[PDB]
Design a protein around this ligand. Structure first.
Ligand SMILES: CC(C)Cn1nc2c(C(F)(F)F)cccc2c1-c1ccc(O)cc1O
Ligand SMILES: CC(C)Cn1nc2c(C(F)(F)F)cccc2c1-c1ccc(O)cc1O
Lengths: 229, 10, 232, 9
């Protein structure tokens, strides 16, 4: 697999290059307005995410069925970590898009949403206090894509993951961090993926409720949702 | 079948 | 404090002897199955483990340094994750089998539950191929307790210090084991990525046993009803 | 809470 032959800096470049763009979306209150906007945004983002995933080294080497599985398992985590990343410079704000910043006071008007808003805001601040770097971020994203569904079903994925770990370390080293600071930062970053997974699961549930409680959902969105059933 | 099958396929 | 002023070896030592005992189920081969009854075994087993987990948490360095409200929060958040990783650890040497207890070995062929079973089985299989060690396991378990649920919120900073502390212990353990720097970093990541899968299994299970409750069938101890309710 | 008291004890 080509991924395994890439150098740390080649790996970082490929990820930066595969990066999707920031898409654009009336202060949303009420389930309809907010969810209409959130789903529409996610719909378009999913098409970019998919073609992004295809440009993550090693991913393309998997069978189509395996690619499908990983995407189905990680899609919401990948959307959320992107949202959290975009919101770093906006404390107490969720930057769904350059023209759509929400705070918790808007999640308040949507049953069982504020709790998840708070979780996302907390992760965002955490990313911030850590001075999380863009190159670090892309590495975390690829890790989520490859890891989240690896046990939901192998060697190949595990090595590529090891490869990505080498890349994170390489980056912190390039940034002048000591050995101790390197393995400490590495652990901190990865501990947040657990929270990312948590927010995805709670979000997935909230969406199932939204689905059955019938805003309209795209067929793609409906399929990604049913994958988690 | 599924839409994801197609989009990834491309 | 004291938790912050411990050597990696002292840290590993504390966690090891703080370990809870392996409890027995009430499983009886001469007794007929049933999805409901078989669930009664699991809930009963889990309820008794919780009482031991509560006292184990108290012996996790730096955990008692926290206010009671923060201790409750961390427990409510991690209780099922901790049962599941303990379960996975117990089942390492039993491929295709989940050792809920010495007298209760189950394989995927049993339950209504299979999906979550396969996730646990897959995780246990992960431990085997990694050759996960007991010293490493107790670290992962204490990390879950402190991480999963993390004004005066300086407690947050305290939890982080302890977490950094345990990270050093993991690395310390891998180094003494003869791993190269690259291998240490890689193994550290591999162990921490597993925690993500444990969180997933916890959330799947939580939503599942929520139905069992509403399904009004399986008995749930008032403590389980509490813990569960914390996630709703 | 049951967990709260258990923690106290
Ligand atoms: C709308 C849905 C397809 C995606 N989504 N859902 C979110 C939720 C919740 F509904 F699950 F509660 C909470 C917070 C953000 C949510 C998103 C979402 C995430 C990132 C993004 O770029 C767009 C989104 O709609
Ligand atoms: C019974 C419940 C309180 C604990 N539980 N639940 C489990 C499930 C599922 F019901 F969510 F599907 C699947 C596999 C294990 C489950 C456990 C459980 C976990 C560890 C343990 O030591 C005892 C258990 O009952």
């Amino acid at each position: 697999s080509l991924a395994l032959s890439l150098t740390a800096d080649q790996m970082v470049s490929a990820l930066l290059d595969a990066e999707p763009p920031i898409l654009y979306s009336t202060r949303p209150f009420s389930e309809a307005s907010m969810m209409g906007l959130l789903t529409n945004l996610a719909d378009r983002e999913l098409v970019h995410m998919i073609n992004w995933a295809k440009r993550v080294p090693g991913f393309v080497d998997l069978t189509l069925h395996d690619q499908v599985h990983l995407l189905e398992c990680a899609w919401l985590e990948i959307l959320m970590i992107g949202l959290v990343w975009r919101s770093m410079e906006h404390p107490g704000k969720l930057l769904f898009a350059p023209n759509l910043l929400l705070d918790r006071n808007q999640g308040k008007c949507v049953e069982g949403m504020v709790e998840i808003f708070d979780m996302l805001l907390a992760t965002s601040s955490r990313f911030r206090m850590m001075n999380l770097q863009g190159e670090e971020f892309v590495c975390l994203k690829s890790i989520i894509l490859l890891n989240s569904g690896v046990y939901t079903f192998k060697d190949h994925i595990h090595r590529v993951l090891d490869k990505i770990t080498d890349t994170l370390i390489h980056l912190m080293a390039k940034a002048g961090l000591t050995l101790q600071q390197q393995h400490q930062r590495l652990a901190q970053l990865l501990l947040i993926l657990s929270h990312i997974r948590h927010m995805s699961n709670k979000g997935m549930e909230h969406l199932y409720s939204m689905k059955c409680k019938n805003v309209p959902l795209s067929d793609l969105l409906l399929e990604m949702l049913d994958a988690h059933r | 079948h599924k839409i994801l099958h197609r989009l990834l396929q491309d």
